[PDB]
Amino acid sequence: SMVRYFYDTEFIEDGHTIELISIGVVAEDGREYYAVSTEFDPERAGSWVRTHVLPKLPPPASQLWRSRQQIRLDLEEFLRIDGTDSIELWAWVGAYDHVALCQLWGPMTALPPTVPRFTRELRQLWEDRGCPRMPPHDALVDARDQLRRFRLITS
């Protein structure tokens, strides 16, 4: 069968690279994943990220802080890539999010075979369904909200 995952990332981007700060992913079965990268340089954060992203992060002793390799491994387990379920990825205005996600494996040719090479655009579905009314920058909170919006849109 098919399982949908809704995700969001926070990152530092400068028109050239995208340095991942955090990633939240929620499956439609209710499972949740959240991690913060130990490998981004907070000194490179612009004012917006420094004031709206970085203060919401966990304290530094939290086990939520993980290396990029750990996050990759954690996502391979979370997405159940070794099993037979098919995977759909969804994000809201997530072009950069998709890149940040794929770059945890490398070039998009390094993606595990069962992870799709594109992320469905939740904003597109929303508009396609006539922009139904939905409810009123932490990545797991945002990912959770995307799932909630999908279920409303598709109800």
Added chain:
Amino acid sequence: SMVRYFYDTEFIEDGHTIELISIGVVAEDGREYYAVSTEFDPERAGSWVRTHVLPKLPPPASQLWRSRQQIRLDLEEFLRIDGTDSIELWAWVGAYDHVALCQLWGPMTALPPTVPRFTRELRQLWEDRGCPRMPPRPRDVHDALVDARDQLRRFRLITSTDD
């Protein structure tokens, strides 16, 4: 009061950067844009890009070869970023193509206000309509302008449907 632009990019992406090779854009009113960047390093190309993308590029002397700044300016004009129509960007999937297009303006904060921050995905629209049988993929698919043209043709079939 809205105009749809269908686009494709070709690039060298290595898990860190996305270095633009070319971009093709087709407006649903028939207008076309195509340019090839003078700034990507062809030696950095992988074997797949070397065989499928590079040989379809135009000769060095072609006026199609342009700087990144020039492509930006050209796109500001072509998309009519200061016009009254709203702009819709469409591509087969967006993601890497959307980042490659938008990095023409540098960081996300510098994208002109009227350019949308997402690209509508034809692949998603095609699936949402029940995966209708489509025409075959054309002769030179990894020529960015050929790709964009074909995307518009598909969009029209997917939406000029009986539903």
